[PDB]
Amino acid sequence: MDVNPTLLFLKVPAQNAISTTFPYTGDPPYSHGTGTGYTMDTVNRTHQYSEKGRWTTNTETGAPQLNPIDGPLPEDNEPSGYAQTDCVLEAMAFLEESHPGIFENSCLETMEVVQQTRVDKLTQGRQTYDWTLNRNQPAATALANTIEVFRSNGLTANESGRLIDFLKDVMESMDKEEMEITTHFGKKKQRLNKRSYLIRALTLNTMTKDAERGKLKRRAIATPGMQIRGFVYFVETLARSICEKLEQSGLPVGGNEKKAKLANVVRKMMTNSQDTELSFTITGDNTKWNENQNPRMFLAMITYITRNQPEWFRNVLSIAPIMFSNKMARLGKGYMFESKSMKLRTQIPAEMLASIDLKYFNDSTRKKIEKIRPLLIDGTASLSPGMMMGMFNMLSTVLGVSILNLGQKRYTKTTYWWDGLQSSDDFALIVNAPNHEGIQAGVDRFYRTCKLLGINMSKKKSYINRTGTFEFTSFFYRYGFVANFSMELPSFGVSGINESADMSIGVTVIKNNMINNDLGPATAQMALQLFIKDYRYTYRCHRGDTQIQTRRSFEIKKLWEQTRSKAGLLVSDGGPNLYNIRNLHIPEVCLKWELMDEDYQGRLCNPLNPFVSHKEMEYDAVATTHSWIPKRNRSILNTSQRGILEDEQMYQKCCNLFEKFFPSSSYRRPVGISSMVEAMVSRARIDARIDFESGRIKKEEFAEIMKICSTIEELRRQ
Amino acid sequence: MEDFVRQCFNPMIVELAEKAMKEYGEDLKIETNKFAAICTHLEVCFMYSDFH
RNA sequence: AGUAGAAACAAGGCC
RNA sequence: GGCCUGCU
Structure with a gap:
């Protein structure tokens, strides 16, 4: 017999045993080098889905730009970025009509938020490209450098503390005759003329994406500068406010609320239909989502949302798409060479791709450089006609929800009608009709309307089947959502913060998976045992009774011998494990309080100890000496940024x-x-x-x- | 009219009034009368406080 | 050689 | 040979 796991689906329906087909137990693919080979491809493809658009030349950054909006209607099914402004405004107007007062209330809430927000909010962000060092620095460091330069160069209105004041400073900066910065190499003063600083403020830094599941080819992900961060924040706030009021928008909520919304939609559609009507659920997926959401459409949406609002609010909201329409995508690390005969390797910065000869590259990178060269300006490529990665997911989801709404049988004016749920880049559409040709017509209408709005359905990853079985962003549904446990598998290991944090986080993860992903009792117990085993093997905190020999075993054994009630030691100090299916919601140190010795209890949770870091997924934690914090890599010392x-x-x-x-x-x-x-x-x-x-x-x-x-x-x- | 507010009052009063205006977000270039009013109120209160 | 897969490692920087 | 780094 040749064992054949995939033959198990002859009996178990695919949805139930779908966890088998998720290879989430091995290392995810990792980019092994420079993301400058994918960034050029992204730029070329974005300019290739819009080539029929109207070329131009920006008069401030001095770089060519593409304007596909209101371009010729697509003639083939291939991806098209030729969004029509009239159609976008029709979608938004119908969305407003179906949901009266959505935009007014959203604008009121966002006006309060923008009048209230402080500059400190820009610190709560991931890596950002700071325009003063041409490197990637944490959000707080980039913000501090930007504010320092602004104060040095005469911009000081941000001292008020509000974010909008800092935005006023940012805008007033671009008019400054010549900025200057004082970066170190003892330091030098480098002066940037108006155009250089403007190009540096609009630039986007691109790095390859790591740890991506479900793709054979690596992508590229970009991180915006520090000037564009605040405007994006305000626009995202408005889009989230709008989406929270839409029943068909699933983006601003968690997994369980997505399940609830999708189940409600399916019940409303399939059940309310009479016997004669058919139903069909399209588990589709949009292709090249980012490379077609032209920011000018976002500006049109932002102008239609903010009708009859104070001019200042309209301007501060509109500034974000205006800056994203002129973005320059910084290429990346740049390629690397080698010499087999001479036995040496060299690294060429991505900046000199515009000047370097093409006799070094492959037959594909040579074409990519030959095609991207016209767009390059001072080491960056114009990327007007598309987005790089998200950064507007809420607004794109608003557009998707509008197109879904556009078929409520009030705008279809025909027997067939459709609705569903939209989450950025993913949709589930539920068609109804009195005959099969009706479903065909409904699908054609939806596809054509989406094509007009500038969003393309992927025809190689979408199927239409009678309502019931369907899928949506990896939430499989077979007459009721089925819990696939293989997506949450990576979370079970030791998270790696510290001892107490790891214990709390692991037990909390086991509890949550028991609640949501239907993890059984016996499986939960085995997960608990395996987690304890891994935790001990990682923190060297074995039970003490064992004769394990490690760097930490000697005094773990000594402490075990010293103690009286050995059944009270924390698992981090070699104590026994006392958890079960009924104690998963109780933090460990609170669990063993009755069993603890007075001396050990006093030493353990002592505020005077020098390890607690005064605090810092919601894991329930208790302050204890086991809350120390790990060191940092200390790799800066070699570099020239020692002074930081x-x-x-x-x-x-x-x-x-x-x-x-x-x-x-x-x-x-x-x-x-x-x-x-x-x-x-x-x-x-x-x-x-x-x-x-x-x-x-x-x-x-x-x-x-x-x-x-x-x-x-x-x-x-x- | 910035000369009047900058001259007729003490330097410290105008400085702290500038700080207050920056706090509230206004710009002295446009709302000069508000700047003068703030400086005058501050001087009044300081003369009230001092010498006691 | 080997890992690895659209680009890299198979040590790097400075005195 | 000595110093420094193991996500900069």
Whole structure:
């Protein structure tokens, strides 16, 4: 017998045993080098789905740009980026008519948000490209550098603390005659003329995407600069506000709410239909979603949403698509060469691709360079006619929801009609009709309308079958959603934060999978045992009874011997495991409280210990000595950016002192626009005053503190 | 009219009034009268406080 | 040689 | 040979 797992589907319906076909147990494919081979391909393809568009030449950045909007209607099924503005506005207007007052309320909420938001919100972000070093720096570091340069160069309106003030600074910067920065290499002053700074503000940094499941070919993902971050934030806020009010938009909610919405839609469509009507669920998928959402359509949507709103709000919302329409996509790391005969290798920056000869490359990269060269300007390529990756998923989902709404049988004016649920890049459409040709006509109408709006259905990944069985972004549905457990498999291992955090996170993951993904009792117990085994093997915290020999075993054994109630030690200190199917919701240290020795209990959770980091998926945690934090890579030391570490040290010292002065700074972010020294001195003076008025402080101490504050103020004023 | 507000008042009063205006978000270039009013109120309160 | 797959590793920077 | 790095 030749065992054949796939033959199991002759009996088990595919949906039920669908977890078998998810190879999520092996290392995901990882990009092994430079993302400059995929970025050029993305640029070329984006310019190839819109070549019939209207070329032009931007008069500020001085780079060619493509304008496909209102282009010739597509004549073949191939992807087309020729969105029609009239059709987009019709979709939006019908969406507003079907949902009266959606845009007005969304604009009100966003006006409140934009008037209220602070500059600190830009720190809560992932890697961003900071335009002052031409590298990728964390969000906070990039924001700090940008604010430093703005203050140095005369822009200071962001000191008010509101985000919109920083945006005003950003806009006023682009008009500055010549910016200058003081980057190190002892430091030099590099001056950027108007055009250079403008091109650097609009530039996008592109890096290859890593750890992608379900694709054979690597993609490219881009991260926006720091000037475009705030406008994108406001636009995303508006789009989320709009989507939260749409029953057919699944993007702004979690998995379970997606399940609820999709089940509701299926029940509404299939059940309400009479016996004679047919039904058909299209589990489709859009192809080249990003390479066709032209930002000018986003500007049209933003202008139609913000009708009858204050001009300032309209402008601050519209600035984002205006900046994205002129974006330049920084190529990337640049290719690398080798010499088999001479036995050496060289690295060429991506900047010199415009000037380097084509005698080095392959037969494909040579064509890619030959085709991308016209668009290059100062080491970056114009990428006007498309997006790079998301950054507007909410608004794109709004567009998808509008096109889904456009077939409510009030706009179809025909027997057939459709609806469904839209999540950016993924849709499920449910057609109805009185005969099969009706379904055919409905599908054709939907496809053509989507093509007009500039979004293409993928015909090689979509099938239409009688309602019931269907799929949606990996939530398979067979007369009721079936839980596939292979998607959440990667979460079971030790997360890797620290000991207590790892224990809490693992037990919480097991509990959640028992709740949602229908993990059985016995399987939950085996997952618990395997997690404990992995956790012990990773943290060297074996049970103590064992004769394991490791770098940490000696004093784990010593502590085990010392203790009296050995059944109370934390699993991190070699204690027994006491979890089961009924204790998964109780944090470990709270679980063994009754069984703990007084001495060990006191030593364990001692605030004086130097390991707790004063805190930092929602995993229920308890402060304990096992909450230490891991080190950092320390790889900067070799580079020329050694001085940044001194900046970090000084900033931490100052912020710790401020924390000392203002107790609430740690809990709630400190607001205000008074310099730090002035705030500290004022607080000290008022504290001394109130203490002397009624308290411990006496006249001598009051005089000493007041004179110290006076000399501090004198030192400040110098 | 910035000369009037910059001259007729003390430097510290105008400085802290500038800080207040920046806090509230206004621009002194446009709402000069508000700047003068803020400076005048601050001077009034300071003269009220001092010498006691 | 080997891993690996549309580009890389098979050590790198400085004195 | 010595120093420094193992996501910069």
